[PDB]
Structures are given as structure tokens and as C-alpha cells.
Automatic annotation (TrEMBL), chain C:
It comes from the Eukaryota. Keywords: Cytoplasm, Nucleus, Proteasome. Its main location: cytoplasm. Residues 3-25 form the Proteasome alpha-type subunits domain. GO terms for cellular component: cytoplasm; nucleus; proteasome core complex, alpha-subunit complex. The lineage of its organism: Eukaryota, Discoba, Euglenozoa, Kinetoplastea, Metakinetoplastina. The 26S proteasome consists of a 20S proteasome core and two 19S regulatory subunits. The 20S proteasome core is composed of 28 subunits that are arranged in four stacked rings, resulting in a barrel-shaped structure. The two end rings are each formed by seven alpha subunits, and the two central rings are each formed by seven beta subunits. The catalytic chamber with the active sites is on the inside of the barrel. The 20S proteasome core is composed of 28 subunits that are arranged in four stacked rings, resulting in a barrel-shaped structure. The two end rings are each formed by seven alpha subunits, and the two central rings are each formed by seven beta subunits. The keyword Cytoplasm applies. This is Proteasome subunit alpha type. The proteasome is a multicatalytic proteinase complex which is characterized by its ability to cleave peptides with Arg, Phe, Tyr, Leu, and Glu adjacent to the leaving group at neutral or slightly basic pH. The proteasome has an ATP-dependent proteolytic activity. Belongs to the peptidase T1A family. One of its GO terms (biological process) is ubiquitin-dependent protein catabolic process. The keyword Amino-acid biosynthesis does not apply.
TrEMBL record, chain F:
SMART domains: Proteasome_A_N (SM00948). NCBIfam families: PRK03996.1. One of its GO terms (biological process) is ubiquitin-dependent protein catabolic process. InterPro entries: Ntn_hydrolases_N (IPR029055), Proteasome_alpha (IPR050115), Proteasome_alpha-type (IPR023332), Proteasome_asu_N (IPR000426), Proteasome_sua/b (IPR001353). Belongs to the peptidase T1A family. Keywords: Cytoplasm, Nucleus, Proteasome. The lineage of its organism: Eukaryota, Discoba, Euglenozoa, Kinetoplastea, Metakinetoplastina. This is Proteasome subunit alpha type.
From TrEMBL, chain G:
It comes from Leishmania tarentolae (Sauroleishmania tarentolae). GO terms for cellular component: cytosol; nucleus; proteasome core complex, alpha-subunit complex. It is found in: Cytoplasm; Nucleus. Keywords: Cytoplasm, Nucleus, Proteasome, Signal. Belongs to the peptidase T1A family. This is Proteasome subunit alpha type-5. One of its GO terms (biological process) is proteasome-mediated ubiquitin-dependent protein catabolic process. Transmembrane segments: none annotated.
From TrEMBL, chain H:
Keywords: Cytoplasm, Nucleus, Proteasome. The lineage of its organism: Eukaryota, Discoba, Euglenozoa, Kinetoplastea, Metakinetoplastina. It is found in: Cytoplasm; Nucleus. One of its GO terms (biological process) is ubiquitin-dependent protein catabolic process. It comes from the Eukaryota. CDD domains: proteasome_alpha_type_3. GO terms for cellular component: cytoplasm; nucleus; proteasome core complex, alpha-subunit complex. Belongs to the peptidase T1A family. PROSITE patterns: PROTEASOME_ALPHA_2. It comes from Leishmania tarentolae. The proteasome is a multicatalytic proteinase complex which is characterized by its ability to cleave peptides with Arg, Phe, Tyr, Leu, and Glu adjacent to the leaving group at neutral or slightly basic pH. The proteasome has an ATP-dependent proteolytic activity. This is Proteasome alpha 7 subunit, putative.
Amino acid sequence: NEYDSDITTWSPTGRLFQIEYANEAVNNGSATVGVKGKNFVVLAALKRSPVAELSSYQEKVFEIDEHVGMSISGLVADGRVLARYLRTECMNYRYMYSNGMPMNQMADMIGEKHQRHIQCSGKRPFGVGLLLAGYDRQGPHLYQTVPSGDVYDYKATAMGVRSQASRTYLERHFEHFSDCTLDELVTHALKALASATSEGIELNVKNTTIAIVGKDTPFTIFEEESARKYLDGFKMRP
Amino acid sequence: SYDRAITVFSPDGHLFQVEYAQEAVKKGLAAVGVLGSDSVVIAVEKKSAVKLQDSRTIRKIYKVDANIYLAFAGLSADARVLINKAQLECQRFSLNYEDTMDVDMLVRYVAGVQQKSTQSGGSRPFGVATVIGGFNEDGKPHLWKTDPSGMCSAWRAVAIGRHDQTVIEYMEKSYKDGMSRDECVHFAIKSLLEVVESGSRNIELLVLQYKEARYLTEEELQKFVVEVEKEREEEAAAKK
Amino acid sequence: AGFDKYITVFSPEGSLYQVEYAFKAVTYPGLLTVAIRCKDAVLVVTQHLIPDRLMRPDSVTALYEVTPNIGCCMTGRAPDGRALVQRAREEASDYQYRYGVEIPIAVLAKRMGDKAQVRTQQAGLRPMGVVSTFIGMDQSDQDGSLKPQIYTVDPAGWTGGHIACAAGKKQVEAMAFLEKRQKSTELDALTQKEAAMIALAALQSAIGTAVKAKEVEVGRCTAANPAFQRVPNSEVEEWLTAVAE
Amino acid sequence: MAETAIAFRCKDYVMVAAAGLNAFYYIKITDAEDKITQLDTHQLVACTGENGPRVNFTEYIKCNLALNRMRQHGRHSSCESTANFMRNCLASAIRSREGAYQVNCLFAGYDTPVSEDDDGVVGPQLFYMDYLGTLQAVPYGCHGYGACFVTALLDRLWRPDLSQQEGLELMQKCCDEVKRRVIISNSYFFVKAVTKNGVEVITAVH
Amino acid sequence: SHRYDSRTTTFSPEGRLYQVEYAVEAIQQAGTVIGVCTKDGVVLAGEKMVPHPLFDSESMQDKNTSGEKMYKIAEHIGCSVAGVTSDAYALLNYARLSALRHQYTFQEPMAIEDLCRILCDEKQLYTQYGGVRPYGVSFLLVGWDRYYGYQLYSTEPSGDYSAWSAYAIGQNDQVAHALLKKDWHESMTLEDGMLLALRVLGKTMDTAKIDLDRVEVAVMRKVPASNIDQLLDPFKHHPKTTPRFQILTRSELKPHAERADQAREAEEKAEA
Amino acid sequence: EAFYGLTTFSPSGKLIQIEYATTAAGKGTTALGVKATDGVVIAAKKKAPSTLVDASSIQKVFVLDEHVGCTYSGMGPDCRVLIDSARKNCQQYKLMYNEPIPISQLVRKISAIYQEFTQSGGVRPFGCSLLVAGVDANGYHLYQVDPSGTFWAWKATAIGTGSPDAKAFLEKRYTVDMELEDAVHTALLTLKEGFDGQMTSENTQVGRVVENRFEILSVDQLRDYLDQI
Amino acid sequence: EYDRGVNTFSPEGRIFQIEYAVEAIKLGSTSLGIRTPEGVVLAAEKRVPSTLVVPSSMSKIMEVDSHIAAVMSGMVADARILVEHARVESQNHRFTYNEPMSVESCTLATCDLSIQFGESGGRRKLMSRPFGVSLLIAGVDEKGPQLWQTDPSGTHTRYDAQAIGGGAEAAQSVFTERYHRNMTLEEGETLAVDILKQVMEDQLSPENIEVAVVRADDGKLHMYTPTEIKAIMSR
Amino acid sequence: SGHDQSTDVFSAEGRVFQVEYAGKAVDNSSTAVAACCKDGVVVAVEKVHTSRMLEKGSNNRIHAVDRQAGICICGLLPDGRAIVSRARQEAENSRDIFATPIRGSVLANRVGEFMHAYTTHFAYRPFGCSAIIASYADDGPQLFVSDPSGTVAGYYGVALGKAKTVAKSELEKLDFSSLTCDEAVGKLASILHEVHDKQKDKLYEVEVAWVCDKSDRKFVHVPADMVPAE
């Protein structure tokens, strides 16, 4: 293949192979699931488990603003850069208007930022995908961004390694998400995340992060200590 | 401006430009530095007497500062650029702090410059390795070596240039700690003559003592080289 | 030393391949234009054919106004010429703001040729695959009268005046017809009607299809009316009927 | 200008002297501050002005001279070359954003043949330097309030062929005159000399 | 695009810079010029291209600044070039600018070694930075300064320079070096030194009865001062003798050429 | 953005890009110049591609200043950049010294742009050669400048296609004490020898440097010289 | 080779330059790190090129601040830039907030410097290549002893016991056993010494390795001398 | 070979192959149609969804550029978003520097000039989308199409995308002189539904927008209960 070595090279069939490679990079990251309810959005992130004594920690879920947060999958450095950019833009907006940025405008800004790096010769696409969970006057929002620059407005979605199982599970309970309560939404997200784990690994607090955003709930991250309420009692019943 | 990435990684984790600069150093004139109890001896290969060079003597060991002297192996022009940078750094240091730069500070600066030469776009690395000797303002003789990759290390006896590994391995088993001024001058030549020809007109040696650096005259060099070559014949006879 | 034809570097024969290839982009679209000048006016006729009946015929055109007194026709890659038109307009405006007088047509053509030459010496820039034909009136000295003027700019930056010129697909046949007609009559002594008839006859003979009025667009500058304007379709129709004899 | 610097050149030496005064608006911070900076082995400058600009200018000049000696393999610069370098620096300062150096200089030196091919100056050299970038070779020069008091005195008493001891007595007379006629207290005068053997710090005169 | 970048300032698997070596090879085909540094002056003798019958001489006044092969950098500095002449002109202008800047700053003539060093950094800069080709020219610098007297320097198209008592660049430089080593001594006069120059040139270009239309000679010597005016600045020391760079004319070069070729017969007739 | 050099050395020490540019500079129409004890005359060949080209609009002889002219052979668009730079240099010199620029200094200035484009990054050498003729304080001058930047001073020379034959013809006919109109006759005859058809006053452009000025010849003047050879 | 650019993606999604710089880490010396409630221990193999080298001039463990140390593996010349940047950022944090800078923040600053590589000049001059250095930053802060690991990709990861360099996989295999949450400082030191023994081609001597400790109770960094290393071995 | 790797290179026959590859990428995108009805412009696009869990309105391809102007994207959506941002910048420049709404032809020319500039430099690649500009300015209703090559053409009716030829043939059956936007919306929706293959794109939605007199000459989306069900 002589059309995949550059970003400003079109394939003869009308393809951009570097962006496809970045999508492949996103497809190899840790699995994460986003679920949108009537008033709440819940993200579930599958972090690395310890090797029987050695617990490694890596920050995947970020808090962007009082009403916004996101989960990354893929290149962690690209996710950090995108988090810094989003936090700066949120701080700029809240300074000018004394209110949080609307989620649609935010998604447009992330899309434009992604597109800025897919057309210049001295640039490369972000090898990371994002799940944006937020709340504004228009209600709950759940977005997914890809290295190509496309932003998808989702009722429920998943991304990462072996996330097709999570997606096909969510495709059976998503139409009821508008009626499930917060606890039911968390259980659905946890089941979707568990559908993406390996054979011999069951979900537990050591290897799962739970992010929640709502109407009166600022974007809150839930980890080892605070995740006891949602993960201590939980098991996949086939 | 032109800022293309010149030094890049290879599929085996190697920087080919740095390795090629090191290979260019491997083809340079040999140089040795010896650390003594109160003196630092620097000897360089002093390529030859062409009979066409100027009668006026020119030193192949360069005075970076009143206390700090340098020798190089590799490309001469890159070495001159590096030496000019080091001299400017010494003057800037003595102008911003009123104190003379220590040997290790200058060595770190030179190593940093060489490192930046391997990570700046549109630029190839310096093909120079250096041996830097001197004294701080509180005695403390210092001898350091830098490579094209920008790595600096202090030695008790160091060799750079062609066949430097052989010289280092030879003087590893024969270097004694805390030698005198005459021993070190004796030690540097016999280590240098292992890879340079027995012709006595191709050695340039300089001794550094506290606030006093003096190049040996040709006759004083002959006195030491005859002794070291004679000792080499007795060593050969002792072997077989 | 292997490619020598993807960037603006000399071939072993002392030629620029990327500039010769831009000359083939002029004739690639299959369009043809003919510009002529009579004793008191200058006309340009460009093929304006719209195979797609769903396309608004008056939206796409190859005739542009550079200045009220200088008009232009672009033959070749349609967007490329558009870009050059913009440049030309800027080269006019700045000139108008620098000297206070309207830019002469020859000066504008020379500056446009200078712009084209830059893209043939800088490596990263692609030449504009169009031939520019500027028509207008030139203010003469010592008598004050106006004279028709045609100036062509090549993708190589070559700038040249013309009594009559053709550019595009089958331009050689049109030039041969114009040269043959020039051997008998004197083009600079003809009237506007005769020059228009000659230009339309050359355009028809180059392609051999007996064009209608909707298939061509004509721009014009006259001594009485120095402004560049497009000839209405009725006058083109009467010209074509006069040619049909 | 508050501090007076004196210099005079004889057949075999140049003697300079600089008041050691340092003050804060009427307060004598110290009276022993050496304002004579040795630039080279046979070169020095006596500088009048406030501490900041004077120290910065002298250190800049000395560091540049040392750097030139390094890059020229220990080749020492002539007095005229160094004086012109200082003059160029001062003249460039007056048209720069940071402003002019508020320093007045008396540059003294002794020129020796650098090699057997040398055919330049061999005697002593003295240069008067204004803060604006003026440079003038003078037999004697002065800066400060007492300068004029000394100058006429020198015009009365200076001779080209004065000996070292008689030159020392003349400098003592000049310093005494400055102490006698200037309201600004210049008690100590920091005398140095340049001869063929280099720079000597003379303690007899103060 | 980066595909067509030739990567001039890059190392090769042997640590050698191919552009520098190719420039050196280019200089090998240039005309030969030989410099001889004596104790009472320095002689430059170079072969110029065969004069076409339609060549015209630029009717320049002051016929001592630049010839067909030899140029003046400063009043005390001269040079000869070998290689790309158009590249040599830019470097000559740069050297003149550097010398005049040094004279502006210090009001003293620039040292020959300092000028040689400053223009060698210019050549070195193009071999490490910029991504363009280096200068394909070698310089033979001559001059006088009070620190070392008469000097002779040679520069490579890599930034390297060396000081020589006698050297040569251009065609057959190895043969010229071999012949100069045979015949050179420190107790050599200027006229003897010039005799060594031509005799080595005429043998490298393989000619008997050395042709005056194909050889150019320049001399850096010292002459008595002419324009010393003490009244305009009474405190300035004016040296008795000043260095002078003079390019020999057709009538001035042939008296020395006659010495060279009769010397040639005197040395070749006794070989039997 | 194209900051690397396009002209590089070859294993034989040759700058093949400059050689190719020189080859391009020798493919234009024949131009020539002749010096004489009281002036220099340069003549070019304006052979239009067709009879519909309005030969009055095409120029191969240019005025650089009130005392210096030029003509070329090769790429015309490449030549126009150098023509404009030379005119600007002449104007700047007149502004600086209030004197006409000497021909040698102008030739040096032109040669520096050639070297700039043969060594700087992202550009190719020029594909034209210049013949510069003028007057200065030390007489009449005629220079040839090539794409490499090298320049020579000539008594009579030619550039373009058929230049070896033109130079051979000029060598036998040129005389050291040739005067002005004799040089014009020689130049016209040399052009006629290699001319494909008949030389008309609309087919040739001639400029004779006469003692203070360049003064491109008029159509009537060229007819007066064409009906005499 | 310059066939591919420095920002190109592999068909598997990995950046070629970053993956090539990772393989340079495995060609370097072995470095260790142990986190325990009593403190954090850094160990490193010196691998001097000769017996004539002054071993203190090739310090594999550098002090970022009085509470933060850093041990590098790979290209020591590039590691100096990272350690200098970390020192500058820590001093800036102390200047601005009048408090010691956290270990995680220092690692964040190091990775922020590391990620800034590329080829497009534009407005900012970037590095032509990523760093061939993996950093292991140890420290004590308000969250107790913390150990972090830095990659050439610019990704920081908090670890309990991490090893970098040539003997990485064997050290991890030893880590799977013989390690728990609440080892004492002496036990961690002995574990580090034994792991260095298991992955060292040369013989272990007090001057052959470098050991440093940041104590939880003290809160300060303590470089161990050869006699202290011998005392560790004599246990 | 190397004659199709960058836009700054002409082929031996005078072609720019990278632009053609971008146009090929456009030709593989979802179908869009547009009609100028002598009283306004109606544009209709089909959006193919790869997931059934997408929120309604996701991946909007029609965006308002000014009050009276809008752009539909056929091709790479992020490139279309960049083009829409450029068009919005052009429209507000006219309203701020010249105090007048931008004419449809002027906006189309600006979009074409912006898209063409990326086909001339080696450091950039052409946009992989076609832009449909629908305006109702002082120059009347205007419908333009901008090609990745940067050429703009005005149309009465236009079709782009994978199912382009059949949609164009269906558009050939309209009159466009008696056609009004009210019935044109239904006509375009019916054409899009008929021409779309139901066995390859399982999840499809029809997104229709228009700007005529009924919206006070404002470019807006249709009321939800106006397009046909199928």
C-alpha cells in the first residue's frame, strides 16, 4: 500500500488510510460504555486490573466542567490534550457568559478540533475516541467522537476492545433508558461493560470507574471507595 | 525554515544519525586524558609533520577557559563550532555570576548542546567527541568525556578517537591511582603510542596544574618517548 | 534524479514537465475560445455548452470582468482560472490605489505572467492549467484615441499581444483558419461585424458543428464604449445568420 | 561626577587614581571602593559613575576581551583596539532602548610588541572617554567635580619625562587639591599605575 | 514534498557527508593555484582558462583588486579561489564585509587567521543546517598581520582550514604538493619564492616555455607607507611599511617567467 | 514548505541541475552582441509563432536604465524577473550615488541572483542567459551571464540556438578597431546567416549603445539598416 | 529510514516512532521501583563502560526535589532534559504555591514536555523525535509514598512496583510473587537488591548499582552510599 | 507511480488525480438532491446510520450559513463542517464590512475559491465532500454546487452521491417552472426514498430543509410532520 504513509494522500478508491489506522488505534483501547437516561448520563470505564498484587492506575475519565465530563479510549496522551483543550474552552465560556457551555456547541468544537488535524501535512489525527457526558438546559447529552472528526449523538453506545458485545447488549435495553431510574441506568451500564470483559474476569470495584452527570448532579467520578454502592452487589445473570 | 526531522528512530530502537556521527568519531585522531594527584595530562595524535605546514606551532588542544582545556576527535569544523560555543558559555557564566565556570558545569553544557544537536529538526548531530580537563577554584582536578549522543562521564583515564576501546582496555590494567606529574606524562604517552606510530613527531601533550598549564617542548617530549618505547621493548622481552 | 517531472525542476532536455502538463490541462475540458480585434473594437467568443438541462445556463461562464475597461476569458481548468481572475482583480485594485489611474491591459498581463512564473520556480506550487485572454482598450499617446488590445498569458508565464488568437481544444485548426483568412484581408482594418463573423466562422470550422447562440458567449470592448460587456443573444444570432450565407 | 578620577601619562608609565566614594543621596556608604578595573595584563580603566552601570560596563568589556583572547589563541589586543571597542559600546548604548551608560572612563595601558613582526605602539597610552562615546588620546585627563582643579594643576606641573617618584608626588598634590577644593568628600583615591611590567597598585598615594 | 528532499546535511553509514565530498571532487577539476609563503612576502600563482580571441578585459581602474583568479579581501588580505566561481563571489563579499566590520569595531586590521576562521564557519553552517547544498569552493588566503607576519591558509568546503608554508589547490594538487615539498626552505627570498611558484605551476600544467596568457600571479608584500598624514591626528602611530596586495601584469610577470623557464633548462640539461 | 535545496552536487562533482538550466538557456532564439571602439550593438531574433501575434507587443531587447540595455536567450518568463531586478538595482544605485550604475556592478548584482536561485532551497536555477551592454565611466561594456552566475566580458558573442556558428562567423569578421555602424552591419549579417527566412524590421529587434544611452532602434531605423546590408 | 514520517500510524494503530523509541528502553540498563507504607525505593544498574569511569558521574538516580527522585532507563543524554524540566517545574510550583509539588503533577509536567515532538515548524519548534527515555519518578506527598512511570508516548502511570530496562520481564515475574501491600522498607530494599541480582549480567558490588530511598516519615530523599548498599547486602 | 500522491502535480494528460480521488470519495457518500422552485430552494439528504441507538438529529448534514443561506454536505462530514465554518465566516464578513446579506452567487464563489485553494498546494489535500449551497438573497432563489475541485455550478435541480444517476433521472421528470416548494419537499423525499436501496443501508433517515417565502426567507429545517413516511 503506497497511499497510507501520509495524511494528505487520497486512496484511489477515495479513502484516507491514516485516519482508518487512528480508528484502529481507538478500537484497541480499554472498553467504555455510555448510557443516557431521561435526566442522567452514566459512563462506565474498564480500567486495568492488578496482576495479583500490583495495582496500576491510569486516568481515563476526566471532569471537563461542573456539568460536563468525558471518558477516553486509545492514546492517553491525545486524550489528555483533548481534555486540556476542552477544559480551557469551558473556562473561557463560563467566564464570558457566567454559565456552562451547551453540549451541542461543545460537540461542534470537538469535531472542528479533530478536523483541524486531518488535513495538514505536518499533523496527525488524534488516536483517541471520546464519550462526552453532560447536561444543560436541553437535558442529558451523550456524544462519541472519532479521529475522523465525526461526532455522534447517542442514546447509548460503547467503544474499545470487544465493545461489540456491549453495543449488542445495549441494543436490547436502550429504548427503555428514558424510563429507568439512576440506579437502573448504572446497572445497565455495568452490564454493558461486563459484556466486554474477558472470560475469567468479573466486574468489581478494583477495575471499574463510574461517572455520573445529571440535572442537579455535577459530573462526579466514582472509584475504589465511592463505588462500593454500585459494584459490591452486582453479578451478570445470563 | 527547513526543520525536517533528520535524527529519527529505527525499527531496532537505534538513532542512525547518532551512530554515524560516532563512526565519524571513530575515524578521528586519537586522544587520551589521564588524571593524576595534582595534574591532568591531555595528549593528542598531532597527525604529522607534512614539511608544508607553517613553522609556527598551532595547538591541537584548545583553551576553552583559563582553567579548562579541551581536545576532540572527529570533524574539525564541528569541533571548532563546539569550542566556540563552550568559550562563549564560559564567558557568559563568568559575566552572570562573577565566578569562573567549574569543569563539570561546562562539560554539562557541552553535552547538552550535543544532545540538542540530536533532537533539533533540520540539523544533523555533531560528529565530535571531546575530552575536557581542568581544575576548579579549589583544586579538584577534573577529567570528562563527551560523545556525539550527548552523554558525559568523568574518567580517571579516558581515550577517544580511533582504536579508543583498545587504549581504554590496555590502560584499565595498568593505571595507578594518584600518580605524580612525571608518571602521568609517562603514562599518557605509552598509552598513546599503542595506537599511534613510533614516530616521535606526532604527539601533542599538555599538562594542567592548579593555575598553571604548560605545553611540553619537543625535546622534553623526546625524553619521555624514548623512555616509554624502551620500556615497551623490555615488556616485549619479558613476555617473550 | 529519477522523477524530474513531479516538481518544477529541469529535465535533462532543459524542459519543465510540470509546465508542459499544465498546457494539456488547457485543452483537457474540450472548450475553445477565439479572440479578435477590429479597427475599433475587440471581441472574444467562448464556447458555452450546457449538456445538463438541469444546470442553470447563466450561472456558469468563462467571461469575467477584471476592471470595467478590461475583460477576461479563461480556458482550461475552470476553478483554476477563477483563482487567477481573483488575483488579477487584486492586481488591478492595488494598482488603482497605488497610482490613482486604472491599470493598463499590457501591465496587467505582464504582472499576471510574473505571477505564473513564480509557480514554475517554487517547488510546492502547482501551475494554473489555464490560458488567460485579457481584452480591452488602450489609451494612446499624442492623439488620445483608444485602440483594441488582446493579451494572452500562458501557464508558463509567457505574455503576448495578439491581433487574433485561439485557445483550447482544436486551437490549432482555429489558428490555421484565422491565418488563412488573414492572408487575404487585413484584420486591423475590418469592422466589428466582419471581425465577429470571422471569429464565429473560425470557431465553427475548428469544431465543425455550426454552433447556435446559446452555445457561445461573447464579450466585447469598443472605442465608443470602452467598458467590457457581453453581447446580447440577439446580436449573436444575427451574426450567426450573417455567417450562414 | 561626584567622584573624581585623575590620570596622567609619562615616558615610562601611566598613573591613574579613582575616588572610592559610594553614597546614598547624602550618606557615605563607603569611602574605599575600587573604581579602577584591570581589563588586561597591561590595561585598566578608571570609571566614574554609579555602581550598577559602571560594574556592568567594565565586566562586559573585560569578558569580551577575555573571549577575544580565547578565540585568538592568547593574542593580546592593543590599547587603541580596546579603547575603540569601549567607545563603540558606549556610542551604541546612547541610541539603544536601555539608554546610555552613565560612566566616564580614563583608559590606561602599556603597549608591548606581541611578536617580532610587530611594529606598532611601544610607549604608554591614555584615553579620555565621555559617557556619550567620546574618545580622545590625551597626555592627562580627569573626570568629576575636581577634574578642572586637577587639569590646570597638571597644565602647571606635568612634564613628559617625570620619574615614578615625582609622578607619585604630583598625584599626591592632585589628590590633595581635590580634597581641598571639592565640597564632596573624596578622602581616599585608589591610585594604580601601568608600566612595562603591568599593573601596580600604589598604596603610598591615597 | 519530503519525498524529493535530497537530505544534503545528513550523515551516511560511514560517518561521511556525501555533499562535502562531491564539492571536494568539484574543486579537483578547477584551475590549479599554488601559494608559497616566504619571509618577505607571499606569492600566489594560478592557471587561468585559455584566453578566447573574443575575450575582452573589463577596463577597471585600480587594477589590483580582483583578477581572473585572484581577489582582494582587504588592504592587508588577498585570496585565490578554486571551484564554483559564482559560489566564490558570495563568500568573497562576505569576507570583505567581515573584515570591514572588524575594522569598524576595533579600528585595526583583522588578523588573517581570524578572517580565515570567520568565513570557515559560514561554510560549516551550510553542512549542518539549512538543508541546502554547501559551497563548492576552496580558498587560498594570503596576508600580513603584526602577530604572525606573512601567513598562508587553505580552506576546504567543509569549514576546515589549515596554515601552510606552501600549498596548492585545483587540478593536480597532489603533484604540486609533491613538487613543493622537494624544493622549499625557510631561507627563501620573495623572488626565489615566485620562482618556486611558476616552476611548480608550469610542471603541474605540463608546459615548457610557460605561457603568459594562461598564468596569473599576485603578491602580498610590504611597501613603504605613502599616505601617512600625522597633522590630521597627531596621536596616531603610523607604521613605516604597510602590506600591499599587487596583481602582476603581462609586462611584470614575464621577467620572472624567463627566470623560471631558463631555470627549467638549466635543471633538465644536466640529467644525462 | 519547500525549504530544501533542489540543486545538489553529484558524485562527479557536477551540479546537474545547473547544467540542465544551461541547456534550457541555449534553446531560445539567436541573440548576439558586438562591441566597437565607440559603442555596443545587441541584436535579437523576434520570430513570432504566427502572423497573428502582433510582433510589436513581443520584446527581446530591454532597457535597464538610461545607459544600459539587455537581451536574452531561453526562458522569457525567467528572464523578466532578472530584468525587473536589474532595473530596480539601477534605480537604487542612482538613488544612492546620483550616478549611473557601472556595468560591472550591475553584472555582479545580476550574477548574485543567479547564484541565489542555484543554491537556496525550494527553487530551481534560471533557464536564460543575458547579454548586457552599456556605457560607464570607463567606456563601453558587453557582458554574457549564464544560469550558473558566471559572467564574462566579451568583444563579440552570441547566445541561443545556432550560437556556435554565429560566434565562428563573428570571430573572422570582427576587427579590433571596428566602428559603430560597421558593428551593426556585422551583427545584422550574422543574424542573417542563421536566419530561417527573411529579416524584416518586425522580425528583428536591435539596440545600439551610443555614447551615453541604449536607445532601442526604431522600426524606421532598422529598415534603414536592413535595406543597406 | 525516511520512508515514513514521524507522525504516521501503523496499520495496527500505533505510532511508528513511539514504538521504535520503546524498543530503545529495553536496550538500556535496568531500573527498579518499590512502593511501601514506609517509603519508596529506587534501584538502578550502573553498567559503567569501564573501570576507569568515576561511578558518581553516571548517576542513574537524579534528585528532582528534596522529596522527589527520578531514575531513568534508556538514553541518559535525553533523560537529562526531562529531569531538568521536572526540576524547573517543581521549583516553579514551590515558588507559586509555597508547597512541595506532588509527584503526579511532576510526572504530568514531564510527560507534557515529552509529548511535544513532531516535524511541522509553523509557530513552535518541536522535537524531531520522541525521547528514548522511560522515567521512574518516586516521591512522598500528602498521599503518602507514590511511584509513577513515564513512557516515550507521554503516558504516565501510577505503579506499586515497576521495573524498566533490559531486565524488565524477569523483574515483573519476580514482582508477581514475593511482594505485598505492606512490606517494610528493609524488605523492599532486599527485594530490589535480589531483583538486581537476578537480572544483572555483571557481579553485584556496592559500587556497581545505585540505590535511593524516599522515606514516608522523614519525607526527604536519601541517596545511599556504597557502605549502605553493602549493609543492605549483608542481610 | 508518484504522479498521484499530491495535488501540486499534474499528470501527463493534464489531470490532478488527488482531486479525482476526493471526488470518488464524494461519489460513495449518501445521496442528496436539491431543487430551485422559482420561489425558494429545497434540499433533501439521506443520512445512513450505522447504529440504531443514535439520538434523533445526529450527524446533521444541512447547516445554516446565514439567515437566508444554508449548505448541505455530500461526503466526508468533518470536511463539510470546515467548509460550513468558512461559509459562515464569509457570510458574516459581508454583514459586518458591507452591511448587507451575502448574495447566493457570491457565497458560492467564496466556497469554491476556498475549496480550490486546497487543490494547489502540496501540504494540503482536497476536501472529500461536495457542498450544496441554497440561498434566498436579493438575487432571488439560488442553488449552487461546489465540487472538491472547487468549481461551482448553478442548478435548477441537482443530485449527488452514490445513487446519483437514478435520482437525477427522477429529477428530470419535474417541471421546475410550475414547481413550488410545498410539493417540492414531498417530491424530493419521495425520490430519495425510491432511489435508496433497502437491503444495504438498514438505518436511514430523510433530512429536508428549505428557504422560501413561507419561512420569511429564512433557511430552516422542515416541520417534522411534512415529509412523507416513506
